[PDB]
Design a protein around this ligand. Structure first.
Ligand SMILES: CC1=C(CCOP(=O)(O)OP(=O)(O)O)S[C@@]2([C@H](C)O)Nc3nc(C)ncc3CN12
Ligand SMILES: CC1=C(CCOP(=O)(O)OP(=O)(O)O)S[C@@]2([C@H](C)O)Nc3nc(C)ncc3CN12
Ligand SMILES: CC1=C(CCOP(=O)(O)OP(=O)(O)O)S[C@@]2([C@H](C)O)Nc3nc(C)ncc3CN12
Ligand SMILES: [Mg+2]
Ligand SMILES: [Mg+2]
Ligand SMILES: [Mg+2]
Lengths: 545, 538, 543
């Protein structure tokens, strides 16, 4: 153990032991010592314009690196401004550690710990300087292990400013967890051998890098059909697996659901019912196998017949080793996949789509032209989200951040900035509506300052369309969903970022290509015609719900 | 899936599915439908006299069977009376599911979920009748899996009285993880090789029945020294392992601690820092290996260099299969155990009131491998712990991190119900005896073959001596005397009162022969306590 | 300010400033310094045998004195054992301050007592800084005794009470004035136009600071009065001929009929939690709220006129604005007359069966309970019998209100009540179920030489629960247990024990037990067969 003049120095050392490359936040009196101590560290300080976005950026870092992104804010409003961001990260399973300042212990005030407990996996306040290092260290453990999530640590001003005696705690990382029991694995390998219509249902954990190779090997060896929840949207896609059946949870005409209904054997990997209500795919007819790092969060419509708890990669590798031949699709299974093939042909169409304001399909097509396996795509919440989700099978991004159970608007730009910082040599494209855009557009200054290579696209309709269409379907009239217009091109330029405004369908691709080629932040406003949205909304489960 | 006329019926079916054999509790208006439904069930309804004891009894059932014991109480005071008991169960790792009534949803109020959250692993209220069965099922999952604990389920009256649609969720039981990875086991087997002063620190999980054979197998093939926390007090004892270094956490003269400080390699099995402060034994200079069903609960003095998570039995069996030679003790290692040797020797009285040691010795003579012993909290607890090495009981319930008095008798009753053919001996002081003695009526009614021993000093000695040490004067630790023999007999139990030293052994022998509840008052002289206290961590 | 060697000395000093006469509790390592410091003060240390009872005893002290009773326990189980007791105190409005030990501040990093007590207290806080020690304790008392009284919990970290501290004792506050003149006049105008006015008395109307003023208001207005059980002692059938009984339990009370008939309902010191407004307020009458705190509005409780302030003052002023006594309307007179008929009929003939008939026991109890004695009642079927005949008990005070329906309260309430006025006798009554949950305090009673006579109605079961099950299911579950020799049980403590073996032995046994100067227990076998009749008079049966 070493002698520290400031708890803050210990905190910084603990952060470095974790391998933190940057911290996102806004300084304040109660927490400025930590900001100060970061000056003598290799950790980069990234000032944001609104704390909520520090949490969003941190979530992106966490999702990509598997190591928690870090947010640092002051007491009071500094902390309460993070709540939505922390809840979003926790619901999506993104590892995030937020260190928030607090009044001196003697002065204790806002009970932030009580406030964050509902939307975090871990929330604790350091009430003793000698606990400083372990509390911060355990924050990371909680955020990163098991089903990842967010963690909040409250840091009293006197504890961070005052001296402390203690040693840095080494970052343990992921424990060496055993695979599921061999006899249980052999039992599933046996079920697979006698299965006529098997299918893998992938959940969040299946999309983790740690399970990437294992998953690929298993799919390559068994050639068994795969469907995925939106949390696992990026685990597999139409272009890397011929038997991919799409993502389930949004649309009512997915081959994945048809295959789950036809299934005689369903194997869930890293899946939790929360990702997609079991009450909509599991009849209870097929033999259900649960594979994940934690026991099945058993439910009324989710009671596994065989539970394989343990290291997912380990289990999948062992399963792969006990599979002798590739599956021969039954007539029905093959028919379902052929249907999706035709279904995708119809969705793609060929067509000119030269109308203006632009048709969603024209925008989706132009977006697919600029997003390649070297580009990351982040998607906000709104009607455009549904359109993009409908065509996820045709995006070839290196990675796609779109899953958003809380349906939190404003996430795209911050997510993009966080993602770019992890791999600054690559480009990132973020897309949102005008409503979502204005909730986090203050970060455009941050992007300019960081010279982040991000292209942000705005689908402009001058309203909260996603809400409007639901009001209509239910009440046949609108309320609180329409607002005024804005000159988004001029808006973006006032930040010193490059701005574009699409005034015709013909200018779309050229504009996007130019904005993409810009070496730094760029914003493209795209007027959109949402009148066909009812057609798309007719393909949602909500329609039945 | 079925259509149930009463949510209560589904709750009972789910309980049967869980294999519950009895429920401990006290009925009340809000929850009486569940009690009524149990009438048509194979589940035995066991009325207790105070809810807290329903939690204590359930804990004993859970500890032994690995399946959660069940408490059933009504709303308000019915549930608040369970708090201390649920906290004790959660602290000791005893699987307990408590079902508490609540006012109708429309009427909601006492926030029981909020009250129980701090002392349970799982606390939830059923606000949707269609979630009834799943909420109950998950209560058991949460209480029985990983490191076991207590779970609380709040059941609104309207929810259990009203109709419900659902199916009995099959009992999946705690999922079976696989042993830690082969590469991880090879790494540990290798550290044990590159180690000169290795030692096993056993925690709670190491004592679970599923790990008994694997543990013995690992100890026998490696012959590595072993020390345990009190939660793991029964994992290994002096007579079943030559290199046992005693239980650590109480006395300042234990070999386990010396060996831990000397160690260059410490392998913790089923251990959590809460069982024994790492600050007391881990300097950090020793390579630290963690083996448990769950990741390590790291802290300033507990950061495992190697962390293995998985089925403990499988992990230990495989580890044992990778060890080729028994350990040859180093000079200092043998020296330390040499000292414990002398220590044991020194540990191996007609005054009245009786001397603690006289009582302890008289107790060891009646407690055998067929007898379960439960120990309450008080000075007598320290004495019995000092000589734990010489007790040879079937099982010993003693770990009590919260130092909750009154646990002994109800623990004994719950333990007896699991194996009715055997005898149970419980020991407490007079203070602890009265906090839960109302259950003597329950014992007589059940004809529980339990022998309760009361060390009588007419005070709260364990607190008195701490005050004596610090202030040289006593406060609030002395109370009046009682006729415990008559007290017990008023319940229909057999009572005895040791009036002389010679009468001790004969009285206990006589009481042990009693086929049913029996109580023996034993006057004790605590004047020597200051001496024993000098052996505790200061 | 001042320099203190131990935070504990400041606590004991703060308690003396509050006037605390004694402390109930069980010591432990984390809190023993406080018990030690108490050795040097005038404050008496009263060890109990179970912490729950320390809260029950403190509640009786607080209720009678108006000043918070004090419980002192150690950390962990010491604190969790108080919860039910603190909840019961809060629910009945009894001022109670509990001080629980806690682990050293530095060790608090590994039981969140503050969170566990918050749902059942008015005030729950932990001293996290020795400089806040005295104020936190002072504020605990202020919170418990002011406004509508309740329980307060204070967590004291061991290092804080053991370590030195700087600070001075904070004097006890105490105190509003009468409601506004305009208000009292507006109300008086409503009274002058009311044909069927009625006062509904709540908890605050029974506080001693209003016994005189209420008496005045009633004597000049002669308006009918009905009370919740929390205010059961505010007025009785004897000192006021237009008293309509306690409302909240039975479905045949004149109080309820007058409330439903009223064109003007004036609630004094009343909060909806004392008696569901959905049971008596249709909303037809003009509602006037008078209390030390604003009204706790709800669906069936929205006062058309709301007066907040010193009750005694307001009532004394309103009385001066009362022109003439009320001339009862025919319907009102008829309802009050029916209550008189009901009372005579309820008094029923010769019940000499054994086990004893509830009514025989009730009569015998009314005989020994005199106007000097305090009566405490536990929860169980006997409670309903006693409530039914509350009008015929003429005790100094009656502790019976129990919204939580918590069993085990009688004996400890009695012990606490006796300690406030040791020169008087206290009679406590419970069933065998409630008795065994707190009977460990019989040792405390013997040790204190408490002049308490505890009566046990014996049925060998939880009858109050059993009758509800019988009603709903035609069968019993979990409500029957074995018998006990209660005479020998009590004697084993060193108290006097009795067991009634025949009907004729009842009165002589009670007299003998009453004459005992110290703790006595009498077990009374009861035949609960007639309960269906009585239970049919409960709002519950109509539910
Ligand atoms: C208003 C709104 C969304 C935004 C819609 O507008 P644009 O972002 O302009 O998209 P578009 O649908 O008009 O293209 S999502 C949405 C969502 C439907 O629930 N997410 C929200 N997020 C926050 C933080 N507050 C309120 C909502 C409710 N919903
Ligand atoms: C008073 C007391 C104990 C009991 C001592 O008396 P006996 O049970 O008579 O034992 P002995 O020590 O006199 O033999 S333990 C003890 C413990 C030292 O902390 N456990 C407690 N449990 C509850 C539920 N409340 C308070 C305490 C504080 N401590
Ligand atoms: C069991 C019981 C009561 C006691 C009944 O028995 P006795 O006290 O023997 O009275 P008697 O009715 O048999 O005369 S009250 C009663 C009550 C009806 O709700 N209060 C309780 N208090 C606690 C602390 N736990 C559970 C209950 C549920 N109810
Ligand atoms: Mg919009
Ligand atoms: Mg004792
Ligand atoms: Mg009874």
């Amino acid at each position: 153990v070493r002698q520290w003049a400031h708890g803050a120095d210990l905190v910084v050392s603990q952060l470095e032991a974790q391998g933190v490359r940057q911290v996102f936040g806004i300084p304040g009196a109660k927490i400025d010592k930590v900001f100060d101590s970061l000056l003598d560290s290799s950790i980069r300080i990234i000032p944001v314009r609104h704390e909520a976005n520090a949490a969003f950026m941190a979530a992106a870092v966490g999702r990509i690196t598997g190591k928690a992104g870090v947010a640092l804010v002051t007491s009071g409003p500094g902390c309460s401004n993070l709540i939505t961001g922390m809840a979003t990260a926790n619901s999506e399973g993104d590892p995030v550690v937020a260190l928030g300042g607090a009044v001196k212990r003697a002065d204790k005030s806002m009970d932030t710990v009580a406030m964050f407990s509902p939307v975090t996996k871990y929330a604790i306040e350091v009430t003793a300087p000698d606990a400083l290092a372990e509390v911060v260290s355990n924050a990371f453990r909680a955020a990163e292990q098991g089903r990842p999530g967010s963690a909040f640590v409250s840091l009293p001003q006197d504890v961070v400013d005052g001296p402390v005696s203690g040693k840095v705690l080494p970052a343990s990382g992921a424990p060496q967890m055993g695979a599921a029991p061999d006899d249980a694995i052999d039992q599933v390998a046996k079920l697979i051998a006698q299965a006529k219509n098997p299918i893998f249902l992938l959940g969040l954990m299946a999309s983790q890098p740690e399970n990437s190779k294992a998953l690929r090997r298993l799919l390559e060896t068994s050639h068994i059909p795969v469907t995925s929840t939106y949390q696992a949207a990026g685990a597999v896609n139409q272009d890397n697996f011929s038997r991919f059946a799409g993502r389930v949870g949004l649309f009512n005409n997915q081959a994945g659901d048809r295959l789950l209904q036809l299934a005689d054997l369903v194997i869930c990997i890293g899946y939790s019912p929360v990702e997609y209500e079991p009450a909509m795919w599991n009849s209870g007819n097929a033999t259900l196998v649960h594979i994940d790092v934690l026991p099945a969060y058993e439910e009324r419509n989710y009671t596994p017949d065989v539970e394989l708890v343990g290291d997912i990669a380990g289990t999948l590798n062992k399963l792969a080793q006990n599979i002798d031949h590739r599956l021969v699709l039954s007539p029905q299974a093959a028919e379902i996949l052929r249907d999706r093939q035709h279904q995708r042909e119809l969705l793609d169409r060929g067509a000119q789509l030269n109308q203006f304001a632009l048709h969603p399909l024209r925008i989706v097509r132009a977006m697919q032209d600029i997003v390649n396996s070297d580009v990351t795509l982040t998607v906000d919440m709104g009607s455009f989200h549904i359109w993009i989700a409908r065509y996820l099978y045709t995006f070839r991004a290196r990675q796609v951040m779109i899953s958003n159970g809380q349906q939190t608007m404003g996430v795209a730009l911050p997510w993009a900035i966080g993602a770019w910082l992890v791999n600054p040599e690559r480009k990132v494209v973020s897309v949102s509506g005008d409503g979502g855009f204005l909730q986090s557009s203050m970060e455009l200054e941050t992007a300019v300052r960081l010279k982040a290579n991000v292209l942000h696209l705005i689908w402009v309709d001058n309203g909260y369309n996603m809400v409007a269409i639901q009001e209509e379907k239910k009440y046949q009239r609108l309320s609180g969903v329409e607002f005024g217009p804005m000159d988004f091109k001029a808006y973006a330029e006032s930040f010193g970022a490059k701005g574009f405004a699409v005034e015709s369908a013909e200018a779309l691709e050229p504009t996007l290509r130019a904005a993409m080629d810009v070496d730094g932040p760029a914003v493209v406003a795209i007027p959109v015609d949402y009148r066909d949205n009812p057609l798309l909304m007719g393909q949602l489960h909500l329609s039945q719900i």
